[PDB]
Amino acid sequence: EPLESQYQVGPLLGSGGFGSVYSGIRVSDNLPVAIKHVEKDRISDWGELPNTRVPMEVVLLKKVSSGFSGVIRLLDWFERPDSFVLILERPEPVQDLFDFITERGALQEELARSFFWQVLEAVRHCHNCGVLHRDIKDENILIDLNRGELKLIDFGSGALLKDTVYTDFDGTRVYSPPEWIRYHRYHGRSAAVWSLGILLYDMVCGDIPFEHDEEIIGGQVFFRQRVSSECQHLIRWCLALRPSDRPTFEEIQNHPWMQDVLLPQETAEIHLH
């Protein structure tokens, strides 16, 4: 069962602090896959499977990959002398939300509502499975352009969800909450809701609101595009400086701006096709 004989390796897609990711086909059935390599030397956090010392990333992916959801599923993985190799689903055709927003600019509220809703369902899925992503942002979201389905990627900075304080963080600083900038401490859910506030602003305004620490801890939110009062309200709530003032997932999805969401299929027909 070698990696080279069960999958046909294609060319690079991307690389960074996650690893190096290639296009691939499962020869078994010509399924499009993504093949992600991570050097053991470069891995910070390690975990155990139900039994085997693997990267945390593999632990989290196994926990969320049960049944269908808005998360890219781990299909297989392999250990090697100096690395691990993850086999993941690859939608075709696909674009990441970061390139999609660059290309189209600020999204219409109807589209932002469908995208944001699907991200909320994928994050809830993660939390229900005991997984905290810790790097929610447009770059870590794939759009299946035919199905109108968003998929969460790159759990490489994630952790088991706990109700106690987190004192480490490896995610994107400009999506990190003020309490991390100021005190090097955060709780999972409330940090996640902050990052989702950044993401919603990104979607409706065409870029993130904050670049510098001073702006993050200032919690002054200037809207650089026309945004409805209801959407401005949900964003300012998610971006409350005090963690305990942020909405719960339930309060976000019950928010008036979040009602009458499009179905994924509607979203593809109206906005992507």
Binding site: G16, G17, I101, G156, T172, R173, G206, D207
Partner: peptide, 8 residues
């Protein structure tokens, strides 16, 4: 302000 990616 150019929009840009941000490393983890």
């Amino acid at each position: 302000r150019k929009r840009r990616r941000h490393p983890s």
